[PDB]
């Protein structure tokens, strides 16, 4: 239909003159941005010029990869007078649509609905290149020394050339990559909702193309509507159909989104250091931590120390100093050990939830793994690695082999792996925060004896931890008169977890607050106290690791504040923290200890 | 719509190029809309396509617009769907010599005076070639002079080039070739406006020719060397430790 | 703007795949069998235009069912080679496709058999209608198809080529070898396999219709009331929707028995799985997870991938009947943790992967480790299953016996009296027929708590947990917070049993003596 006359006026005239609301002009806001932006896309509410016209429409439903060809050329209309040399240097322009309302799953597409606007619902998963091909075209011819002339390329074929502007020879043609121009192509995996798959069926897949600079705007495990067109495949090939004579078929998409980057302002900072320094945040802190249980507070405040990670230094480039936090729990099964730490996992910068065996996203180590496009070796490594400024959650420690276990030790005793593998040798920086869990042999902790006699770890990474935290059987009447009534009401002052981890990645920059040597010698004095009076009626000692880890959650408990270096008044909190896990740890025996070491609190 | 402008705007090679950019467009349009028309490669299909453009608008022209066999097929189609000088007495056209102009790259305005001599005086001849080739050659010494000032490796070229362009081995044909043209073409208010647009005047300037010639001595011939010469000789010399 | 379809249904007769010979081509011929599989909606060549070679003429016609290659006649003939043509796609009708793969079903099949299977192929509006892992009963003619599997075979093979006879003088014999297999088509097919109102407004007002509905679902069966209790809410599923944040439950509940063979434990799942809608009878032992979860294949057939229908992914608003739990392997009971973990699973394979749904609610069997349960150690030590596995369950049973004279007399009298043909020995309150309706209204009835009620429960817990007070005695395996999301899934599904909307503390007071009884004790 050669009504593009009319239709290339009124269309014009409705990206000019429109108007909605104030008399506002929405699409100059677009162009100009364009244009400020070196951009290649816009975006058309289809709603409005919907309201108006619906046979726009229709002549598009009947052939809308041709209702392309006005639109394009109107986007470098309306550039060209509001931006001169665009169309010089951006060489043609894309298009995306919003706000259509009908609806189709993966499987309900019929042969009645293709080539038209269609509109699905899906997952991007299994996201394979950003892989180049043509847009512009030009030669090395052999006959001729020389080239050919710039061509654009349709949607669906190759090209090839016998005629020459020398002569009508068909020599031997060859495409000079080294200077023709090139656009974006993707190649994607898409599938239903697990979520509405009624029951017994199951969900059918699909395949998508995405164009238009646009690649790279998806991740796998994301909700996505993609609009578009639908179409089938003459791929060549073809005359070997057995059966019946039937085609694939294949989306072109035009928009994307990912609904169904974090980073500071002033303002948002401003108001950080204002609560920062305002009385004592850290009450607050574990209030807000994690409301998943009610639970206890102690070990919610020992992963807070966890969770900020202090400072390290070297003396001059050694006697280097951890500034990163570790922890371990335990404790019976029948309480909530598996929780918090996935919740960590969804408040953090650079999480993990990884895993042993099992339901794991890698198996905590590094290896020369294949894949399974094109078989690409690669290098992962455990998520250890992945967060060696950040943290590594695990739970189910003990259910770990050799080397398994090798690897976690090496981790928090030199922060660096190795690998003597595969024709390839070398050493990374694994100065991550480490977290786990276990399970007591038994149920219940044994509490007449002491850790390593009761649960079979080892001591050489169990002496890395500062804090080894436990809890047991809860037995009283107000135990379940707490926990029952919130349990069921799961099903009948603390500030945003948002506004925590903006806190957290405003504090890995800035603070590295220090201590003044103004009355540290008693450190000196209560050390050698305690060390003296562990003897007394104790087994096992205290160390200076202990000390060291005090230092560091001084310097933590100092981030935390975001004060400017240690404050005195703080370092009670620290040792008091250190001084009731030693307490829990040990014996009956350390009943003594109870009355002796409380003078220090 | 880059490659649109670029092969409209390859017809040269004010209501024009508007009307016909638009018309190329919708026409690719029509074409392209319906499942009538298919197998065209886009290698070719901006031609006739401007050919029937120009029909469209007001004044066409036939020559110089379809500048094959394809191309009546696809315009019925569409239409539906809506040695050189002993040769004696040989010829020639317009384009033949611009091709034998154009191999120098020169600009296409002394083409047009040598095709408007050819024109006007290819009437009494023997041979075209004679003619057209002293007259490219002396549009070449004359507006080439300053390549060759510097550049005496250049006459030796220029003459092998044209002495197996049109296949000899022997030149002092073309020798005169060039002096008889010269006497011809002599007095002519055009050939006079070259001369003193691209001023050879023999090769020479005429600041210096008519001191050389109404009785001098303070005329320069330059067997000295001038000033900025040796000032850029002097760098050749002033690495001399390598 | 006409293009039509149509079906014939109930035809008299039956036959199996087997019953079907070389007679019966071109015939319309009903077959029942059963599903494996689904496949791709393609939309397929109805009509499809194309165009000559040398001009834009057009030809809008087709050859459609096989032959699908060449037309020859051109309206302007005058042509060096009107032999070959041109197409293409959108002066052209199509319709819509699918496939399946069809299967025999157990209950008419010989010895020495596998079911034997062959595909089968839809066409029209008529599609949607088929559904993997049911049996149906299709309708249609015997379309056949080329093949080449079939080489490598005894005996002589046909092959077709032109004559060169009585012509003369114009591989150059054109030879097309010619094989072939005998699949399907379907012109319909269906799903194999009122005064109810006033039916069911009479048994509803009874009180101990509890006691019937429990008493009557293994009539097969003697006596283990807590076996017909459990199955009976096993069915009834727990509302998973009862969240804010999205983080979601594992809706229905899960069982397990123990006893000591020479019992009759197998009886219950031979029950349900000849009662259960949707169910399935498994090895427990000789299988792997790649027979239960889903392995799926990669690009045959030149059409993409497609996921297999899983096994344990069926049960879908069901069961897994699954006996000889304890000889289970290591990944598939990983396996079945991730599948009990949270109610969905992760695949891959190829680099493909894969997400599902499901809410699967299993009873299963345990063999203890000799057999032997020793009457006064705890649980742990005689399960032989790691914590997590032998966690995640509202329920253990156990069943052991002991010398009781006077009613194992009347158990042999039951056993033997079972062999008297068909005996009046099972006469229930009703049958399986109105039990299925029942089951359809009930399992739909969302019941609703109160303040009382859960006031109550409270309490009731904390006397439950005081039971761990003096634990060890009375105890096999401890307490926690599982038992009483278990406990609230459980008086969900009663109230649903009762198919009534209010719970009350009398009603979930037989669960309260129930996981009361649901363990074991212990020496001094
Ligand atoms: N205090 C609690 N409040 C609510 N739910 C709890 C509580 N304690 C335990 N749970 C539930 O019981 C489970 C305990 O799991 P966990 O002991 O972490 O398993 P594992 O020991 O294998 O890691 C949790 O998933 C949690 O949902
Ligand atoms: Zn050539
Ligand atoms: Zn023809």
């Not at chain 1, 994301?222 to 078929?249: H, M, Q, R, S, W």
């Not at chain 1, 250890?384 to 928090?412: P, W, Y």
Request: glycine share 4%; with cysteine.
């Amino acid at each position: 239909p050669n009504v593009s006359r009319t239709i290339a006026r009124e269309l014009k005239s409705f990206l000019l003159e429109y108007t909605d609301e104030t008399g506002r002009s929405v699409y100059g806001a677009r162009i100009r941005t364009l244009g400020e932006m070196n951009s290649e896309s816009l975006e058309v509410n289809y709603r409005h010029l919907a309201e108006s016209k619906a046979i726009l429409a229709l002549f598009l439903a009947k052939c809308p990869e041709e209702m392309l060809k006005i639109f394009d050329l109107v986007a470098m209309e309306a550039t060209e007078l509001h931006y001169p040399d665009y169309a010089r240097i951006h060489s043609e322009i894309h298009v995306r649509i919003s706000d259509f309302p009908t609806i189709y799953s993966l499987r309900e597409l019929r042969e009645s609905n293709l080539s038209s606007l269609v509109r699905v619902t899906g997952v991007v998963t299994r996201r394979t290149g950003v892989f180049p091909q043509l847009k512009y075209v030009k030669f090395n011819c052999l006959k001729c020394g020389s080239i050919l002339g710039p061509f654009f390329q349709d949607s669906n074929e190759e090209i090839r050339i016998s005629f020459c502007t020398n002569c009508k020879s068909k020599g031997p043609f060859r495409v000079n990559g080294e200077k023709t121009v090139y656009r974006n192509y993707q190649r994607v995996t898409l599938q239903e909702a697990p979520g509405t798959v009624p029951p017994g069926r199951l969900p059918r897949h699909r395949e998508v193309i995405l164009l238009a600079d646009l690649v790279d705007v998806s991740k796998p495990g994301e909700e996505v509507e993609v609009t578009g067109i639908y179409k089938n495949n003459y791929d060549g090939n073809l005359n070997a159909k057995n059966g019946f004579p039937v085609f694939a078929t294949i989306i072109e998409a035009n928009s994307i989104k990912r609904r169904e980057v974090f980073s500071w302002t002033e303002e948002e900072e401003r108001e950080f250091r204002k609560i920062s320094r305002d009385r004592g945040i850290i009450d607050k802190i574990i209030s807000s931590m994690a409301p998943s249980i009610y639970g206890h507070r102690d070990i919610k405040t020992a992963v807070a120390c966890s969770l900020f990670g202090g400072v390290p230094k070297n003396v001059n480039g050694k006697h280097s100093i951890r500034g990163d936090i570790n922890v371990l729990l335990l404790g019976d099964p029948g309480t909530a050990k598996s929780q918090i730490l996935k919740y960590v996992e969804k408040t953090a910068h650079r999480a993990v939830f990884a895993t042993g065996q099992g339901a794991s996203a890698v198996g905590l180590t590094a290896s020369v793994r294949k894949d399974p496009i094109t078989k690409e070796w690669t290098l992962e490594g455990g998520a250890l690695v992945l967060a060696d400024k950040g943290v590594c959650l695990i739970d189910e420690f003990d259910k770990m082999n050799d080397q398994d276990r090798t690897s976690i030790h090496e981790a928090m005793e030199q922060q660096s792996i190795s690998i003597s593998k595969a024709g390839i040798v070398t050493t990374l920086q694994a100065r991550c925060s480490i977290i786990a869990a276990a399970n007591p042999n038994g149920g219940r902790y044994n509490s007449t004896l002491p850790l390593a006699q009761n649960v079979s770890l080892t001591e050489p990474i169990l002496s890395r931890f500062d804090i080894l935290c436990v809890v047991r059987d809860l037995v009283d009447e107000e135990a379940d008169e707490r926990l029952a009534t919130f349990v069921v009401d799961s099903h009948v002052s603390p500030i945003p977890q948002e506004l925590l981890m903006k806190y957290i990645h405003y504090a890995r920059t800035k603070i590295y607050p220090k201590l003044h040597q103004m009355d540290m010698d008693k450190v000196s004095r209560v050390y050698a106290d305690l060390r003296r009076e562990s003897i007394s009626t104790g087994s096992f000692p205290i160390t200076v690791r202990h000390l060291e880890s005090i230092l560091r959650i001084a310097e933590s408990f100092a981030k935390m504040r975001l004060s400017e270096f240690v404050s005195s008044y703080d370092l009670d909190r620290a040792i008091k923290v250190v001084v009731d896990s030693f307490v829990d740890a040990q014996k009956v025996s350390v009943r003594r200890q109870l009355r002796r070491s409380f003078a220090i609190y | 719509q880059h490659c649109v402008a670029e092969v409209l705007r390859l017809d040269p090679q004010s209501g024009y190029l508007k009307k016909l950019t638009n018309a190329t467009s919708i026409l690719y349009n029509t074409s392209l809309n319906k499942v009538m028309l298919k197998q065209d490669e886009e290698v070719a299909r901006c031609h006739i396509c401007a050919y029937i453009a120009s029909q469209k608008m007001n004044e066409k022209h036939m020559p110089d617009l379809c500048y094959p066999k394809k191309a009546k097929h696809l315009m019925n189609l569409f239409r539906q769907s809506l040695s050189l000088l002993v040769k004696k007495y040989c010829k020639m056209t317009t384009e033949e010599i611009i091709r034998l102009c154009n191999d120098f790259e020169l600009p296409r305005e002394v083409a047009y005076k040598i095709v408007d001599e050819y024109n006007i005086n290819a009437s009494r001849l023997v041979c075209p070639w004679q003619l057209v080739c002293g007259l490219v050659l002396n549009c070449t010494f004359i507006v080439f002079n300053e390549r060759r000032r510097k550049d005496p490796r250049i006459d030796h070229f220029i003459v092998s080039k044209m002495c197996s362009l049109m296949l000899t081995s022997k030149v002092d044909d073309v020798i005169e070739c060039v002096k008889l043209v010269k006497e011809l073409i002599i007095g002519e208010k055009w050939f006079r406006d070259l001369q003193i647009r691209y001023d050879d005047f023999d090769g020479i300037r005429y600041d210096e020719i008519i001191f050389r010639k109404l009785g001098s001595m303070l005329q320069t011939t330059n067997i000295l060397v001038t000033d900025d010469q040796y000032n850029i000789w002097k760098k050749r010399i002033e690495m001399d430790l390598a | 703007e006409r293009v039509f379809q149509i079906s014939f249904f109930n035809l008299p007769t039956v036959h199996r795949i087997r019953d079907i010979r070389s007679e019966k081509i071109g015939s319309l011929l009903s077959i029942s069998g059963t599903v494996t599989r689904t496949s791709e909606v393609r939309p397929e060549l109805y009509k499809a235009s194309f165009t000559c070679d040398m001009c834009r003429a057009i030809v809008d016609n087709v050859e459609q069912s096989f032959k699908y290659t060449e037309p020859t006649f051109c309206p302007n003939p005058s042509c060096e080679n009107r032999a070959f043509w041109t197409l293409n796609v959108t002066r052209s009708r199509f319709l819509d496709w699918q496939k399946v793969r069809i299967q025999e079903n157990a209950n008419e099949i010989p010895t020495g058999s596998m079911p034997r299977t062959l595909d089968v192929i839809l066409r029209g509006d008529s599609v949607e209608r088929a559904k993997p892992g049911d049996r149906c009963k299709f309708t249609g003619v015997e379309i056949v198809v080329p093949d080449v599997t079939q080489l490598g075979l005894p005996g002589v093979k046909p092959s077709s080529t032109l004559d060169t006879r009585g012509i003369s003088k114009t591989r150059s014999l054109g030879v097309r070898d010619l094989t072939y297999k005998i699949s399907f088509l379907a012109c319909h097919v269906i799903s194999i396999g009122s005064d109810e109102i006033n039916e069911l407004k009479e048994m509803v007002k009874d009180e101990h219709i509890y006691d019937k509905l429990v008493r009557s679902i293994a009539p097969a069966v003697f006596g283990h009331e807590a076996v017909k209790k459990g199955i009976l809410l096993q069915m009834l599923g727990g509302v998973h929707k009862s969240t804010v944040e999205g983080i979601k439950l594992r809706g229905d509940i899960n069982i397990c028995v123990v006893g000591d063979p020479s019992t009759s434990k197998s009886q219950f799942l031979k029950y349900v799985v000849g009662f259960a809608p949707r169910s399935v009878y498994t090895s427990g032992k000789a299988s792997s997870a790649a027979g239960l979860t889903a392995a799926v294949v990669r690009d045959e057939e030149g059409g993409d991938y497609t996921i297999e229908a899983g096994a344990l992914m069926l049960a879908d608003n069901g069961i897994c009947c699954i006996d000889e739990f304890d000889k289970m392997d290591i990944s598939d009971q990983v396996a079945i943790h991730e599948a009990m973990e949270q109610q969905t699973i992760s695949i891959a394979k190829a680099g493909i992967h894969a997400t599902l749904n499901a809410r699967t609610s299993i009873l299963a069997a345990a063999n203890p480790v000799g057999g032997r349960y020793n009457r006064k150690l705890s649980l742990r030590g005689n399960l032989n299953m790691t914590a997590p596995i032998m966690s995640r369950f509202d329920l253990f049973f156990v069943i052991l016996d002991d010398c009781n004279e006077k009613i194992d007399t009347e158990l042999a009298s039951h056993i033997v009296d079972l062999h008297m043909k068909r005996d009046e020995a099972i006469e229930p309150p009703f049958s399986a027929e109105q039990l299925r309706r029942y089951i359809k209204y009930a399992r739909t009835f969302k019941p609703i708590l109160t303040k009382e009620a859960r006031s109550y429960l409270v309490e009731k817990y904390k006397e439950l947990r005081k039971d761990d007070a003096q634990g060890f005695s009375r105890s096999s395996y401890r307490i926690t917070v599982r038992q009483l999301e278990s406990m609230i899934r459980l008086s969900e599904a009663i109230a649903r049993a009762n198919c009534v909307d209010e719970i009350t503390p009398s009603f979930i007071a037989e669960a309260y003596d129930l996981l009361r009884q649901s363990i074991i004790r212990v020496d001094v």
